[PDB]
């Protein structure tokens, strides 16, 4: 019948004011779920190159990498060393065959910069924020349900706002902005000027978002065979990509 | 040389 698997990484950032980047945590699991009959063998190829850690002798450049990896007890690792291969006899229903943490670079580019332009007249306490988002993910791959957080000066108000396009949602809500941007792809540039009143501790702007069909790490599942109708997933989501301003 | 988890 029926086997699921996904790959899901949970992505956390902390990017500069100056669009450095301070900090990057990767946190990923493989999850099965299947109801196979007894004594069923399920085999999972992952991405063939990767490796594991810091080699001392090596060292570690651009290719596929983790940190650190961990498996559920079930798991053989027989082939896991010459051919990224794990085998296990699954049980009915969830199980977590795979962690993996990565916190050195992505093999790839962070997938959103923010670009921020604040103008604060001291003054007739007028508060003006321009926020551009760029989508530095492919053109063809999709970002959803992105809403980004901004911590407002306690008692500000909004004036007006003017988004860059009509599917955009923002307010201002528990003395922040919530800026929701339904749509985007690789490449799309959304702004947002934002006109307040504050009668500095304006930011860090927090991002939160699903990235379907991607994974952080670039680690894949290459194969999941039998020794039934398949579904595999790759999806990385944050609520914790932090952005100073 | 790998490390394990219940769940």
């Not at chain 1, 109708?229 to 914790?240: E, G, I, N, P, Y």
Request: charged share 20%; with cysteine; aromatic share 8%.
């Amino acid at each position: 019948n029926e086997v699921f698997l996904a790959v899901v990484e949970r992505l956390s950032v902390l990017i500069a004011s100056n669009g450095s980047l301070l900090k990057v945590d990767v946190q990923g699991e493989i999850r099965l779920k299947s109801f196979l009959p007894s004594g069923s063998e399920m085999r999972i190829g992952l991405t063939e190159e990767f490796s594991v850690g810091k080699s001392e002798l090596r060292g570690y450049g651009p290719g596929i990498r983790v940190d650190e990896v961990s498996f559920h007890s079930s798991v053989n690792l027989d082939e896991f060393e010459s051919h990224r291969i794990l085998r296990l006899q699954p049980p009915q229903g969830e199980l977590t065959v795979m962690r993996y943490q990565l916190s050195d670079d992505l093999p790839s580019p962070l997938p959103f910069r923010l670009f921020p332009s604040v103008q604060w007249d001291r003054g007739s306490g007028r508060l003006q924020v321009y926020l551009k988002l760029r989508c530095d993910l492919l053109s063809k791959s999709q970002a959803l349900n992105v809403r980004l957080h901004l911590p407002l000066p306690r008692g500000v108000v909004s004036l007006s706002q003017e988004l860059s396009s009509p599917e955009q949602k923002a307010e201002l809500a528990e003395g922040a902005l919530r800026w929701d941007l339904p749509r985007v792809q690789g490449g799309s540039q959304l702004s947002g000027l934002f006109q307040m009143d504050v009668p500095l501790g304006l930011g860090p702007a927090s991002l939160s978002f699903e990235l379907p069909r991607h994974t952080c790490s670039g680690l894949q599942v290459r194969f999941l065979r039998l020794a039934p109708h398949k579904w595999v997933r790759h999806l990385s989501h944050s609520d914790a990509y932090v952005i100073r301003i | 040389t790998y490390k394990f988890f219940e769940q």
